[PDB]
Symmetry: D2
Subunit: 410 residues, 4 copies
């Protein structure tokens, strides 16, 4: 026996030849994209032989082995239906319907407090999925850059705990939600901001990362870190939204000065620089696709699903998922956790970074917000999704009524 | 082939016939108790044939065949290492280590608010486990009765939603936590109590179950309900603590009138009578073993794991597990959700009702309370337990660092 | 010289005789009512001689002397324009203008929570004046009885401090106002109700008066006390409004139990009896005339203006006038203290008990309330009144712009 | 009759000439200082004739007439015991006892947050009085300069209402006290600061004075105003404490931006410039004497008692006294209003600006603060004073038990 050969006959079909395009679409049906980083050596070997023998590019048992031996373990888990979602093909056709039904929630208002999000059309709407195994699906305007805005907070919280530990980080930031009419206070009674998902705690968390280097290097470190979380997919930066956030951040300076007087930053902090770093981190640009991979990184215990690298310590990813659950969706956090029960974080640009732990990561984007600051179509999508699949954090994996479970077969 | 025959060879060793005790301890090693209701027909036939021929109590292939013939499916998941916890034996010696570790947290104060909770010794400490498949382990004082006190709040919430639906119930009770600065208010900003786990919201929920019958039938309806959740193990009632709870409930009467004034009960409610039914529900008695079966019922999508009947609709168990997470441990709810991340509920008698969804239910019981009203040893046990097992709601089931996973084998 | 001789010539006209009506009309022009208690002996001696000599009916110097001998000190200070308001008659024609200007404020809502306050017509409106010297004026429906409701709180506070002292009384009740979204709390941070002018503190003050006797004796004592304060003018009681206050006082029972749980009553308090005494005290009845005398008792350092008896210790009246200033007009206290600056107290029946210290006491009564619970015309009158006279607590008695000062001559 | 002659015989005492010093101590015994501005023409004429004839300094009837003719109206109310406090001589010996009783309350902590108020010794303590008629008394360390700090807030409130009116001003600042549970918020429920006496409300009121001018003239405008309130007595400015307030006002800058975010300033306001003007107004310095004249100005319906000049409209002085009563002493405002019942304002330098309407104005000064920020000795003095005299806003002027009435004989 041999694994690459047994895999050859699984796809060879009993036939003696594999047309390689038949291999490529058998591959994409896994949901894996041809461009997957864990697959490069095999596509290197495929683009090589698509030149060597332009004569009927069918692969025999020996030549197929010559391309896929290097990636055979991941190719076989893909083809022996061992990924977290075995029938990915049907699942995307449910993701499509959920996308198209949220696509008719035309209500809401595009945040216009800056001219940069004000120029974004209300008709943009994209949903991107990446599972814990790297299966990909996207639908809508999923390659348009937009800023993370307030979706950056868990990402930077993760880095801070990843680099410094839970106990150090939470001397400066609380670990609970305020209370639905305490969105107006900055501090809890330990004179600590309530949690990293609000502007007060975000400004404090920003204060802890890479102390002692300048703001240019600090930003560099976060970009390198956010690069690994998305498996080197698109991470960018909008200078335009940066300047309009620095000229308009009256409430943020208010928070900085309040935090400075009440001695909530670590020793030797330059408060006004931290606010400039903060406005920077909120105009890091993503797409629906790249950011869905970062979301899958947290769904996966801190291991990037399309590269296999350890990017965050499991302690950092649990804390962040805990704190997204409670505090992630403004005054809709409490109701969102009850009805949807998925760690999620929203942003002023209309993004929702969603995690379904041990299944998949996601990013939704439609600019128009509802009156609580959450993307209209984005929020409508996350309801239908939990309505449909037993992904609610406190669903039962065995008895779950008329819901669907994508992690099983028949 | 056929099922009773193949298992026979697994236990037979290739020997003879199986000595009946060798079958029994092989059975108990799964963690099932001989008393399991799903096993009654099989133990009835073994006690019969242990009479039919008293010389030579060993079972050949045909005699074993018709003793386990009726319960063969559950016997096979038991013997084929298919229960949710395969090595129950090693795991229980981990529960014992955790138990003996919390047993040295001698601090705290036994609630003295009535002479009935004061009558409990501080060195009582019991932990009882019930998995979603019915494997059991107990350690410590797990047969001593005590009242649920506030551990009854999610149970009646579940019953209320099970009978009435999410939409009706949450017209009278909110679904979020107060906020560590609203632990003293009764009503949230819609003049609904904040959630079913606070005394105000509990009292409101009590006003909803089985409206229109008298308090005697109402009690019967809730007790019959709790009997199915505990698979008919001990569910009792302390009249003694009841008399002390009704004479000392000034704050509850205080809550009762305020709710009446602001019309938070359903029409035709007898407020002062609803307050008696409430005091009753707080002195229903359990032991650690009986109540751990109640907790496993919620871990199990609403199916009693040791009897198999459906007791609660998945909507009832999800909502209840959502709100135990957020609002379950008094003002320690936030830290508990962050650090332990498991649905749980405490009571002033020293109970902690714990749920690890899709795995097991638990009840920890030591009377001495800490400074927030949560049992000292209970809270220490529930910290160590998540430190040890990847049970924190947001652990990753694939990458979980040096934690143990009892759901996996070698 | 001799005083009664001096006074005869002031009225005598240079003439022989003074006709008896000419004395009476000279008397009422002082503003004193002939029925004044400090005048009884003189009108007694007048009704004596209106029989002795039915044909006169003029008094010579020896006979005028025989009627005014007994009351001469008070009669001349009246006639030598030594009363606090020298030209009382012109002053009453300004009170008439103020009354007639508020009488065109037709808005507001009559409190309907009990059927007894709902039966009062919205077109009832009365203003009654009694100065620190006993000059009286009334305009409108000033002899219609109505309940004090919440106007009773200072009256009983005065009695409590009068009998027990500031230091004892204020172990149970604060001395400050809450804060304008804290109309909803019961206790301040020291577990004391905030001040005697809110229902929580009122109920507690009610617990201090005449401890150790039953509720019938306790009420009797307060009636005897309110009797001296109104100089034996009309104080009555509506059992009707009492019965609807006890059947509808859910918030007060709510407050009663909260206070009992937090141990805010004095030892040996029967909580439920205290609430019954409280409902009684709010259904004491007055008219505009009768109650304005109580207000003058507070305007006069604790001495009843129409009897001269010391009824309250000066400590009792300052405290009460202090707390009426801060806390007297529901959420309108702050606005009322700024713009009107007079110690005042309102009630849900539409009463306003007003004090201009060292000048006069008042009672306004119109049933229709504004949106904060204060009678429309009562509030409109008190604005117009302070607009007109330098009566605002922080007016200057020497430089007061274009305002009128009724205590001066020309 | 003749006004000047009638006085001559009252002090002449049956004699033919009045020794000029005998006139002088009879003058000062009313409590007037010879330095009174309303008396200048009369003292000018006295030292002139004290030169014209260095010959036996006694005054006959016709020469006395020519000295006080110009100021005779004020001299007669002084000598016919018609001032608001007739026996000023006995009363000041009550102020002295009250002073020496507060002087032994050694508790409290001198504010140390800037090295400039930390530079003040805790044993400094001074009480200065000014009546509505100009009678003066001082005792203790009453000529030591110190900054008004938060004692300036009602002064600038008054100036804003005097210049703008109650209604305009209170579109930006509330009129009630927070509530002993709202000492940490900036805004009340209408997104307006609670009242002019808190840092948030003061900062906004500061935003209303003399809009459209630069900060240099704005200061000039406020100073000219404070000079008239003190009758041109000492009003200064500490640059030293100013620089330290600009470096350490993190919480004030915190208030500035929050107010900017919530649109609580008038249009075209430069917030950060307003904050420097604010720190400027908070380190204007007074002595106990000069500022005691400011307090009497508010006691006097807006007329400076020692010059006769109208400085504030009665609308501005009433509002300022209403709000001093309610909101004037940090978290002690409630108890202070109950037990003392007098308009007052404190500052972190150890000042208490006190007003007894229609009687007198005052300034107490001892640096060490109690835990609420109010001078220890000052609060002890203001209690003792009201225990003694029926000045409590709601004492009764007719029946007041064992208290004194200095307005009586
Ligand atoms: N009308 C308005 N809206 N929002 C307003 N703000 C309120 C003041 C803010 O500064 C502070 N915020 N919370 C503070 N509270 C604490 O630190 C201790 C603490 C005590 C009790 C409970 C929770 C914590 S202090 C700025 C924004 S004011
Ligand atoms: N939405 C709603 N409106 N009204 C509601 N109430 C129901 C229950 C409430 O009980 C209490 N009232 N005041 C309390 N305050 C204290 O004990 C001391 C204290 C500590 C710290 C800071 C302030 C004060 S506790 C009464 C009103 S709930």
């Amino acid at each position: 026996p041999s694994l690459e050969d047994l895999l050859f006959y699984t796809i060879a079909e009993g036939q003696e030849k594999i047309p390689v395009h038949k291999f490529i679409t058998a591959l994409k049906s896994t949901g894996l994209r041809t461009s997957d980083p864990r697959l490069k050596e095999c596509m290197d070997m495929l683009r090589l032989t698509l030149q060597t023998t332009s004569d009927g590019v069918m692969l025999d048992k020996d030549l197929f082995k010559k391309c896929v031996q290097s990636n055979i373990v991941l190719l076989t888990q893909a083809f022996r239906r061992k990924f977290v979602i075995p029938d990915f093909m049907s699942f995307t056709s449910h993701i499509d319907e959920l996308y198209e039904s949220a696509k008719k929630q035309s209500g809401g208002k595009v945040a216009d407090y800056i001219p940069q999000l004000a120029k974004f059309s209300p008709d943009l709407w994209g949903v991107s999925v990446c599972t814990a195994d790297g299966q990909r699906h996207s639908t809508g305007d999923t390659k348009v850059p937009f800023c993370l805005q307030s979706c950056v907070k868990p990402l930077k919280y993760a880095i801070a705990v990843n680099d410094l530990g839970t106990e150090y980080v939470h001397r400066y930031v609380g670990k609970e939600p305020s209370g639905l009419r305490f969105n107006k206070l900055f501090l809890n009674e330990d004179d600590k901001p309530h949690n990293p998902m609000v502007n007060a705690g975000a400004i404090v968390v920003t204060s802890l990362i890479k102390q002692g280097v300048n703001n240019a290097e600090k930003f560099d470190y976060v970009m390198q870190f956010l690069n690994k979380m998305a498996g080197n997919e698109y991470v960018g930066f909008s200078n335009a939204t940066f300047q309009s956030e620095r000229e308009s951040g009256d409430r943020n300076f208010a928070i900085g000065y309040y935090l400075k007087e009440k001695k909530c930053f670590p020793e030797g902090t330059d408060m006004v620089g931290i606010l400039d770093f903060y406005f920077q981190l909120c105009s890091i640009e993503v797409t629906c696709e790249s950011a869905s991979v970062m979301a899958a990184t947290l769904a996966n215990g801190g291991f990037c699903p399309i590269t296999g690298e350890r990017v965050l310590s499991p302690e950092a990813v649990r804390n962040t998922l805990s704190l997204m659950h409670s505090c992630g969706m403004y005054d809709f956090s409490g109701q969102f956790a009850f009805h949807v029960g998925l760690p999620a974080k929203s942003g002023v640009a209309g993004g929702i970074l969603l995690v379904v732990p041990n299944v998949m990561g996601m990013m939704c984007w439609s600019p128009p917000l509802d009156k609580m600051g959450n993307s209209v179509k984005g929020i409508h999508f996350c309801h239908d999704l939990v309505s449909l699949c037993n992904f609610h954090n406190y669903d039962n994996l065995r008895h779950f009524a008329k819901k669907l479970d994508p992690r099983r077969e028949g």
